[PDB]
Write a protein that binds this ligand. Structure first.
Ligand SMILES: [Mg+2]
Ligand SMILES: [Mg+2]
Ligand SMILES: [Mg+2]
Ligand SMILES: [Mg+2]
Ligand SMILES: [Mg+2]
Ligand SMILES: [Mg+2]
Ligand SMILES: [Mg+2]
Ligand SMILES: [Mg+2]
Ligand SMILES: [Mg+2]
Ligand SMILES: [Mg+2]
Ligand SMILES: [Mg+2]
Ligand SMILES: [Mg+2]
Ligand SMILES: [Mg+2]
Ligand SMILES: [Mg+2]
Ligand SMILES: [Mg+2]
Ligand SMILES: [Mg+2]
Lengths: 118, 52, 138, 324, 177, 168
RNA sequence: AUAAUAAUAAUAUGGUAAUAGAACAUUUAAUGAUAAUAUAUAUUAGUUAUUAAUUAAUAUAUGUAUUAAUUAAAUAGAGAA
RNA sequence: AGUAUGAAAAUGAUUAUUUUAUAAGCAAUCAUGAAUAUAUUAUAUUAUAUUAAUGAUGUACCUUUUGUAUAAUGGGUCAGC
């Protein structure tokens, strides 16, 4: 795998997958995972492993996943949080009972700190 | 009755339980005392002026 | 001839040095008031010390007031969460405190489907153009 | 006894602590400790030094205290020691910022125009930006009065931990600012504090790890996003491009239509490329032909200036700005 | 061609002509592991990208010069000239001496209405721009012209003034990049 | 007589209120609110003198009362310091004056209605052409300056979510 | 051998008539710190898996909660007569 | 039908912001441009709030019925009961 053009390029993107959910990122990008991370606390660093695609403007390395040796991709866990609280009402059409389906899903804000060809 | 020393980790602290009323009373006494000090000084200055 | 446009930089907290979002937490309780029992117990019982030991970048203020028991956090962005912990047991209070510390200070917000990444960066590949496409349309 | 006397002795003690910044007292201050932990400052950087960095110069109380009727009262801070403030530190921090940031920018963009470079530098380390950074870190201002503090009966440790300058009480009350100098502005004080911290870090680490300061700066200041492409504003770019081509060993640039669609419409599209020989320099799209031509020239100039070489390359020293 | 990577379109599993916006099809499309050449489907106007910068603007010691990525897709022979000056088509001429210049200057001051820039250009086989560069007119004439322009501007409606402002804003925006 | 500079910060509401105005009010006019509206809509943003003239030559009964009110507001403005040729009617509205006395209308074949007897008041706020109007002209000018132009081939946001994948 | 909180694996969680379990708002009675830096009510914007309460600002009242909490009870919750 | 107080709502007029004169149906929800307002950490390529560009989905509520968008019942609206 001649990974020289990617290595050379100033701009570079990745399409890493957390639980088969793809997230297309550059360095500085701020990923918002739609679940509560249990393993990592806030401040902890995540070394991304299942990286599908690593792309320049005109080239892209692709793997299933790409060799961990070829790249780096460090995210930082920058705040567990939640979505806004919502209460949709559930009811049938001639029935006074109206069940409130309250919802407030969890989020985990990551920040892609490092992304480079090793 | 917690204190800042009680917790033994220096980022933890307990703010001082001084009642608002007591603080107000203290303020009143201090500003009053200042006023008294000032008034006496002014009187003295007036007396000195009268003298010469 | 060339001229500058006065412009300012955008701080990305994570990339260089991570500054921890939660900066200060205030435990507020009442000596009277049965709603403040669990808070009082928490304050008493060696958990707060452990917490402070764990997180020495957060300062932990402990205040007494007449009302309900309060957990107000204070974040780097300047926002302030305040959770009323009325009638909660010790463990519930601790969980609430954990939740607060976890939060990045930002306001809660509805996200649309797949609104995942938030970039300041211009696209690495360009924006599409019909004149510059690989397959020309018809 | 008298409460005035009690207050007076407290004030005197506070003044003495400010003059000293005794190390034990500084250590006791929770806010300082948390700041230290937050920034991951070196262990050699003492807590007294950190307190000092937050202490702005304030030798004598100004004449504007005499009248709150004119919209100012300075009743929060207490006079400082002449030889224990953030002033010397601040200057050193400013110098460091001016050196390192500028150097980093030059490394990134070795042909960047002088004015553009200056603007970029400003963006990275402007006073407002520095103040914002300080706020983010948690450098809070001593807004509370001395008397109020005494009444509450709070320790001097907290005072030491907060930022200390001649902050005008009733600054914008009833929507009335007084427009005082830089020595009474909050933003400026915050900027000084962030520079002072940097200077303190430098002082402690220089002999052991010389580049520790610069990596701290990189982490905090140089980590911030700035698209350099948004900084530029050209005037007659075609002429400038032609001049550049003349200067280098390049053929005269001419603009040519590559592709065209929607001529005789409200919004056409004209793609023109500025060629020098067979090589294209700049690509320019536009609604009009003229616009497209202009855009191609601007693109070419961007490519010239914002060229960023690799770290593996030997240093690129540019041949100055293209003087049209 | 330095690199001999296989080249790929940005491939959907669905019909691209009917469902170009459908991200799902793109997500589905897996391609075999390795290096590829995906030529960008974009103009290189705003890009500071290293794959976009031309070789002449790269430094001599740049490794990127040798690599084949600033692709010369277009050809200058095929493209026609746009808003090109007459000097660029048939070369610049430096023929007029000092005396001729002095005469031109004398003429222009004397009577800019009779001896206008275009007329001077026609006479001496040179550009109106060059005439301007050479010689100032009488400042009175300039003042008159400014006054005329002001009068014309005043003669506008509200709408026209707004349109002119918009045009000016657009022009300013062009030179931003 | 001082070397102290200042900068004033005021809300939109504060700005609005502090501009010189004058607040006319009618007495308990005998009319419907609808009838008042039918006239008062004509006297929207007029100069006070023009409005007064219109009221004088109006066929309606409320008109005279409106004219009188305008005259009173002018007089008040003069007393304050303002000029009558400077004053324009900024706002003029009406309202129910309350205590409308209901009274049954007896109809044929043991039917009824209730006849109310409406009383209203007209209030109006006169503002100055010299200040308020100038201010709003300035605001309009600023807004015009701010306004981003129509660009033909302009940068519109690629609306929709990306979907973790390049489509180009 | 319990309780609270948190993990892991599993199963379950549509619901009229109906049955069962658990809460909250409101008003009164018993007990009851505190205080205009306070309390109550209202508006706006935040916060807590949110009929509820809390934070801040603003407004008006009051030298002040039959207040928090536990019990006892109810003229205890209204788009349907 | 006490006395004070009263930004409780329905309801009327007026002003401001915003949308609206080639577009068709419970008038909402979700997507999504734009405009405006506020914001003593908008550092911004910022955040919230308001607003019928445009797109998609969407047959009031209750009662009574095997079954109701029903052109079956009942309600002019809000306040108190
Ligand atoms: Mg229903
Ligand atoms: Mg049914
Ligand atoms: Mg289809
Ligand atoms: Mg009344
Ligand atoms: Mg009759
Ligand atoms: Mg009627
Ligand atoms: Mg159920
Ligand atoms: Mg009842
Ligand atoms: Mg009701
Ligand atoms: Mg209901
Ligand atoms: Mg239309
Ligand atoms: Mg239809
Ligand atoms: Mg049906
Ligand atoms: Mg019906
Ligand atoms: Mg019908
Ligand atoms: Mg009916």
């Amino acid at each position: 795998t001649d990974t020289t053009p990617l290595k050379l390029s100033n701009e570079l993107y990745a399409i890493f997958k957390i639980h088969n959910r793809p997230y297309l990122v550059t360095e500085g990008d701020r990923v918002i995972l739609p679940f509560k991370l249990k393993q990592a606390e806030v401040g902890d660093i995540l070394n991304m492993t299942d990286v599908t695609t690593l792309g320049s403007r005109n080239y892209k390395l692709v793997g299933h996943p790409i060799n961990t040796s070829l790249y780096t991709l460090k995210a930082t866990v920058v705040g567990k949080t939640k979505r806004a609280f919502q209460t949709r009402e559930v009811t049938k059409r001639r029935n006074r009972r109206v069940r409130h389906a309250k919802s407030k899903g969890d989020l985990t804000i990551l920040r892609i700190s490092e992304l480079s060809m090793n | 009755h917690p204190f800042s020393d009680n917790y033994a980790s220096p980022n933890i602290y307990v703010v001082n339980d001084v009642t608002s009323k007591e603080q107000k009373s203290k303020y009143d006494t201090i500003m009053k005392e200042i006023q008294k000090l000032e008034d006496d000084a002014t009187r003295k200055a007036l007396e000195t002026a009268r003298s010469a | 001839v060339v001229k500058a446009i006065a412009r300012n930089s955008i701080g990305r907290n994570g990339v260089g040095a991570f500054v921890f979002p939660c900066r200060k937490i205030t435990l507020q309780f009442c000596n009277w008031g049965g709603s403040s029992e669990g808070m009082r117990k928490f304050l008493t019982s060696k958990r707060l010390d452990k917490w402070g030991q764990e997180f020495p970048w957060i300062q932990f203020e402990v205040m007494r007031k007449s009302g309900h028991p309060l957990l107000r956090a204070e974040y780097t962005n300047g926002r302030e969460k305040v959770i009323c912990v009325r009638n909660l047991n010790i463990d519930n209070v601790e969980n609430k405190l954990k939740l607060l510390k976890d939060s990045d200070g930002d306001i809660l917000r509805r996200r649309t489907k797949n609104d995942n990444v938030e970039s300041l960066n211009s696209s690495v590949r360009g924006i599409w153009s019909p004149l510059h496409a690989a397959k020309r349309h018809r | 006894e008298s409460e005035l006397a009690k207050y007076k002795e407290y004030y005197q003690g506070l003044k003495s602590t400010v003059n000293e910044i005794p190390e034990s007292v500084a250590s006791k201050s929770p806010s300082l400790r948390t700041l230290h932990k937050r920034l991951q400052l070196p262990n050699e950087l003492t807590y007294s030094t950190l307190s000092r960095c937050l202490t702005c110069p304030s030798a004598k109380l100004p004449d504007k205290i005499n009248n709150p009727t004119k919209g100012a009262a300075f009743v929060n801070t207490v006079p400082t020691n002449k030889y224990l403030d953030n002033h010397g530190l601040n200057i050193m921090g400013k110098n460091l910022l001016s050196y390192h940031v500028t150097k980093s920018i030059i490394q990134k963009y070795p042909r960047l125009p002088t004015v553009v470079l200056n603007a970029a530098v400003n963006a990275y380390i402007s006073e407002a930006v520095l103040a914002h950074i300080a706020k983010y870190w948690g450098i809070e201002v001593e807004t509370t009065s001395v008397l109020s503090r005494y009444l509450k009966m709070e320790p001097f440790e907290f005072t030491l931990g907060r930022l200390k300058f001649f902050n005008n009480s009733l600054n914008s009350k009833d929507g009335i600012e007084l427009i005082t100098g830089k020595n009474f502005s909050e933003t400026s004080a915050l900027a000084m504090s962030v520079r002072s911290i940097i200077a303190a870090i430098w002082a402690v680490t220089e002999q052991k790890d010389s580049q520790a300061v610069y990596r701290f700066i990189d982490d905090h200041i140089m980590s911030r996003k700035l698209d350099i492409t948004k900084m530029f504003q050209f005037e007659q770019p075609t002429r400038e491009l032609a001049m550049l081509c003349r200067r280098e060993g390049l053929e005269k640039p001419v603009s040519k239509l590559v592709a065209e669609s929607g001529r005789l419409s409200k919004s056409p599209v004209f793609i023109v490329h500025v060629f020098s020989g067979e090589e294209t320099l700049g690509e320019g799209y536009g609604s009009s032909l003229k616009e497209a031509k202009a855009r191609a020239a601007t693109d070419a100039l961007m490519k010239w200036y914002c060229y960023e070489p690799l770290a593996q390359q030997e240093p690129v020293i540019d041949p100055g700005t293209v003087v049209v | 061609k330095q690199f001999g990577f296989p080249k790929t379109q940005v491939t959907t599993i669905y019909n691209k002509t009917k469902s170009a916006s459908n991200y799902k099809g793109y997500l589905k499309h897996r391609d075999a592991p390795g290096m590829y050449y995906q030529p960008s489907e974009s103009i290189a106007t705003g890009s500071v990208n290293s794959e976009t910068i031309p070789r002449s603007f790269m430094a001599a010691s740049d490794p990127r010069r040798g690599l084949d990525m600033p692709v010369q897709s277009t050809k200058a022979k095929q493209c026609p000239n746009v808003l090109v000056g007459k000097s660029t088509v048939n070369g610049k001429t430096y023929h007029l001496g000092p005396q001729e210049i002095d005469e031109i200057r004398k003429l222009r001051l004397d009577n800019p209405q009779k001896y206008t820039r275009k007329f001077l250009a026609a006479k001496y086989g040179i550009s109106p721009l060059f005439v301007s560069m050479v010689s100032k007119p009488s400042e009175q004439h300039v003042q008159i012209m400014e006054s005329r322009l002001q009068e014309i501007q005043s003669r506008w409606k509200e709408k026209r003034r707004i349109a002119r402002e918009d045009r000016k804003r657009r022009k300013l925006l062009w030179y931003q990049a | 007589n001082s070397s102290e500079r200042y900068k004033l910060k005021l809300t939109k509401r504060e700005i609005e209120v502090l501009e010189p105005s004058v607040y006319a009010q009618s007495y308990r006019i005998k009319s419907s609110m609808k009838k008042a509206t039918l006239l008062l809509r004509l006297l929207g943003g007029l100069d006070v003198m023009k409005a007064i003239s219109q009221c004088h030559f109006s066929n309606k009964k409320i008109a005279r009362e409106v004219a009188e009110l305008l005259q009173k507001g002018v007089k008040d403005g003069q007393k304050l310091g303002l000029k009558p040729e400077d004053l324009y009617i900024s706002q003029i509205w009406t309202g129910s004056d309350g205590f409308w006395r209901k009274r049954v209308e007896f109809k044929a074949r043991t039917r009824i209605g209730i006849i109310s007897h409406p009383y209203i008041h007209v209030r109006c706020i006169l503002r100055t052409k010299s200040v308020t109007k100038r201010r709003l002209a300035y605001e309009a000018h600023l807004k015009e300056q701010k306004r981003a132009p129509w660009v033909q081939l302009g940068d519109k946001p690629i609306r929709g979510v990306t979907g973790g994948v390049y489509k180009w």
